[PDB]
Design a protein around this motif. Structure first.
Motif, PDB file in Angstrom:
ATOM      1  N   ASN A  21       0.865  -1.174   0.000  1.00  0.00           N
ATOM      2  CA  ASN A  21       0.000   0.000   0.000  1.00  0.00           C
ATOM      3  C   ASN A  21       0.914   1.240   0.000  1.00  0.00           C
ATOM      4  OD1 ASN A  21      -1.927   1.966   0.462  1.00  0.00           O
ATOM      5  ND2 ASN A  21      -3.022   0.755   1.989  1.00  0.00           N
ATOM      6  N   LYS A  22       1.122   1.864  -1.147  1.00  0.00           N
ATOM      7  CA  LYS A  22       2.031   3.008  -1.178  1.00  0.00           C
ATOM      8  C   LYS A  22       1.491   4.285  -0.575  1.00  0.00           C
ATOM      9  CE  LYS A  22       4.771   0.854  -4.763  1.00  0.00           C
ATOM     10  NZ  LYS A  22       5.654   0.998  -5.945  1.00  0.00           N
ATOM     11  N   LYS A  23       0.270   4.221  -0.049  1.00  0.00           N
ATOM     12  CA  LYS A  23      -0.346   5.380   0.593  1.00  0.00           C
ATOM     13  C   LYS A  23      -0.021   5.371   2.092  1.00  0.00           C
ATOM     14  CE  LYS A  23      -4.341   4.034  -0.467  1.00  0.00           C
ATOM     15  NZ  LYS A  23      -5.823   3.963  -0.264  1.00  0.00           N
ATOM     16  N   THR A  24       0.502   4.251   2.573  1.00  0.00           N
ATOM     17  CA  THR A  24       0.897   4.129   3.967  1.00  0.00           C
ATOM     18  C   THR A  24       2.424   4.269   3.990  1.00  0.00           C
ATOM     19  OG1 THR A  24       1.114   1.666   3.917  1.00  0.00           O
ATOM     20  CG2 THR A  24      -1.038   2.525   4.371  1.00  0.00           C
ATOM     21  N   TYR A  25       2.968   4.794   5.079  1.00  0.00           N
ATOM     22  CA  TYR A  25       4.411   4.953   5.189  1.00  0.00           C
ATOM     23  C   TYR A  25       4.868   5.230   6.609  1.00  0.00           C
ATOM     24  CZ  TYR A  25       2.775   9.826   4.581  1.00  0.00           C
ATOM     25  OH  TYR A  25       2.065  11.004   4.715  1.00  0.00           O
ATOM     26  N   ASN A  38      -5.170   6.467   7.562  1.00  0.00           N
ATOM     27  CA  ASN A  38      -4.618   7.782   7.264  1.00  0.00           C
ATOM     28  C   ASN A  38      -4.806   8.728   8.452  1.00  0.00           C
ATOM     29  OD1 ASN A  38      -5.125  10.681   5.629  1.00  0.00           O
ATOM     30  ND2 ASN A  38      -3.556   9.344   4.712  1.00  0.00           N
ATOM     31  N   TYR A  72       0.415  11.521   9.046  1.00  0.00           N
ATOM     32  CA  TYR A  72      -0.449  11.705   7.882  1.00  0.00           C
ATOM     33  C   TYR A  72      -1.069  13.089   7.866  1.00  0.00           C
ATOM     34  CZ  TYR A  72      -0.029   6.683   7.156  1.00  0.00           C
ATOM     35  OH  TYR A  72       0.491   5.431   6.905  1.00  0.00           O
ATOM     36  N   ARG A 127      -0.559  16.243   5.294  1.00  0.00           N
ATOM     37  CA  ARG A 127      -1.721  16.735   4.576  1.00  0.00           C
ATOM     38  C   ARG A 127      -1.879  18.272   4.741  1.00  0.00           C
ATOM     39  NH1 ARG A 127      -5.685  14.855   7.352  1.00  0.00           N
ATOM     40  NH2 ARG A 127      -6.565  16.925   7.866  1.00  0.00           N
TER      41      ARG A 127
END
Ligand code: SRM
Ligand code: SF4
Ligand SMILES: [K+]
Length: 456
Positions: free
Chosen positions: A149-153, A190, A195, A199
């Protein structure tokens, strides 16, 4: 499963005796599991609160996790103050609903034993003349990720600025609240502060915080870290006080064939004049030992197999609980580490680096409890016997390691490290840590901006 709220890892000999009794008497595993967030865990409770309550402990609806504090500061005197403030932040924050869970720490430079980059809120102590004068605030750390999941980091915390001691609780509360309000409303993946900051922007979040506190931050005050390890063995404390930090593999406390680790601890707890401190490295410090009592204390630890010499490597290695108790586990961690470090020790000896160490961690699944995402060399569980190998972090823990290889096995893992440890051993510079060398030698690109370059 139950975990106790123990700010700063400080627990009394009296409280220790109560939980030791409960551990062996009323749980399936009969062990005491020291965690990497300076507290303990009982496994398989077949009342826990009445006994906690009786000794003064509580097991924290609440998204507040255990507040950490540098356990054994080089400037021994700063601890008590840093500790008083860890305990106040912990009580002030006690219930506003947080989207996700919040982690906070009190750090005493140059030790980053509490791994501040894995945390939401960090108060880095600044002292003058043996007196704390304020805190450098760091916000936004967080390790959890989702496979593919490249939206998590994972992200490291960001500096916000300096603030005088008198403005500590007002800040801790504004940070928490700006997260409470600004945290994501739809998805929980998110929600994290790491996150929200990405944002709205660090400056944007910072200003709301200043606005809400009623202050304006001062420029960040100089600070540096030299390590994240515990000071295994004895160290001079304050006055005639001495500190004995005992290494405990995986922090699992139990009596073993010829190694009464658990009994050793109860026998020590009975004679010990001060308290104990659970470290951020799953070990235990016997604090406040008068010079007179050292012989007594040491003999017992020696007897029980609590002071068994292990290589610097094993002293600087860590793994999460994982199997058999964790329902989220994907691959072993605690149960895999010893054997793996045996295999690693052999390889370090093979290269003439036995006296050295590499910050090596094994996390069971991508949730990241093992803090492998702040490791020079991390192992991220993907399947039974299978892990993602990450490389490129540093000794102090300010760099997130990029994935080097994915879904490989121990034998494959071992072969990859044999190769590079060899490289490093013959090619590194004067006192050059592993992760640094892999970044300098071109073995792996560094993660310079997490939210954008962690993933390939
Ligand atoms: C015991 C411990 C690891 C260890 O081996 O020492 C642990 C074990 C578990 N943690 Fe943790 N985590 C522990 C430190 C951490 C850390 C590292 C740290 O805080 O220093 C992280 C990384 C930083 C971060 O949170 O980003 C971490 C990230 C998680 C998360 C993922 C959080 C997220 O934001 O998504 C979960 C899963 C979840 O909450 O959804 C998780 C969930 C769990 C659970 C409770 C699994 C579950 O929800 O059913 C684990 C249970 C195993 C068991 O049966 O005992 N645990 N957990 C630590 C408990 C610390 C404590 O005393 O409170
Ligand atoms: S990292 Fe995963 S396997 Fe390890 S304790 Fe946390 S949730 Fe369980
Ligand atoms: K440990």
């Amino acid at each position: 499963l139950l975990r106790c709220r123990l700010p700063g890892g400080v627990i009394t000999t009296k409280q220790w005796q109560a939980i030791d009794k409960f551990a062996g008497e009323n749980t399936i595993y009969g062990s005491i599991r020291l965690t990497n967030r300076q507290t303990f865990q009982f496994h398989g409770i077949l009342p826990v609160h009445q006994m906690l309550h009786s000794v003064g402990l509580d097991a924290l609806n609440d998204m507040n996790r255990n507040v950490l504090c540098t356990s054994n500061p080089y400037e021994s005197q700063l601890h008590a103050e840093a500790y008083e403030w860890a305990k106040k932040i912990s009580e002030h924050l006690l219930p506003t609903y947080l989207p996700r869970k919040f982690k906070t720490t009190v750090v005493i430079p140059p030790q980053n034993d509490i791994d501040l980059h894995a945390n939401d809120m960090n108060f880095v102590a600044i002292a003058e003349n043996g007196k704390l004068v304020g805190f450098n605030l760091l916000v936004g750390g967080g390790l959890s990720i989702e496979h593919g999941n490249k939206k998590t980091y994972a992200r490291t915390a960001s500096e916000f600025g300096y603030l005088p001691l008198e403005h500590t609780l007002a800040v801790a509360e504004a940070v928490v609240t700006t997260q409470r309000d600004w945290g994501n409303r739809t998805d929980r993946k998110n929600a994290k502060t790491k996150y929200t900051l990405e944002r709205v922007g660090v400056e944007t979040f910072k200003a709301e915080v200043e606005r809400r506190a009623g202050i304006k931050f001062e420029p960040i005050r100089p600070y540096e870290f030299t390590g994240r390890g515990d000071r295994i063995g004895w160290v001079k404390g304050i006055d005639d006080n001495w500190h004995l930090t005992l290494f405990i593999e995986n922090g699992r406390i139990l009596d073993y064939p010829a190694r009464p680790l658990k009994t050793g601890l109860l026998e020590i707890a009975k004679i010990h004049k001060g308290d104990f401190r659970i470290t951020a490295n799953q070990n235990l410090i016997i604090a406040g030992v008068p010079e007179s009592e050292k012989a007594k204390i040491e003999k017992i630890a020696k007897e029980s197999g609590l002071m068994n010499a292990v290589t610097p490597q094993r002293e600087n290695s860590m793994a999460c609980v994982s199997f058999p108790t964790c329902p989220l586990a994907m691959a072993e961690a605690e149960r895999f580490l010893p054997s793996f470090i045996d295999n690693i020790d052999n390889l370090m000896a093979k290269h003439g680096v036995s006296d050295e160490h590499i910050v090596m961690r094994v996390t069971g699944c991508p949730n990241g409890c093992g803090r492998a995402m702040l490791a020079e060399v991390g192992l991220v569980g993907k399947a039974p016997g299978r892990y993602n190998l990450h490389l490129g972090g540093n000794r102090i823990g300010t760099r997130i390691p990029r994935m080097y290889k994915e879904n490989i096995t121990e034998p494959e893992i071992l072969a990859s490290l044999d190769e590079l440890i060899g490289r490093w051993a013959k090619e590194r510079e004067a006192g050059e840590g592993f992760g640094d060398f892999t970044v300098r030698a071109g073995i792996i690109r560094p993660v310079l901006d997490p939210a954008r370059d962690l993933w390939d």
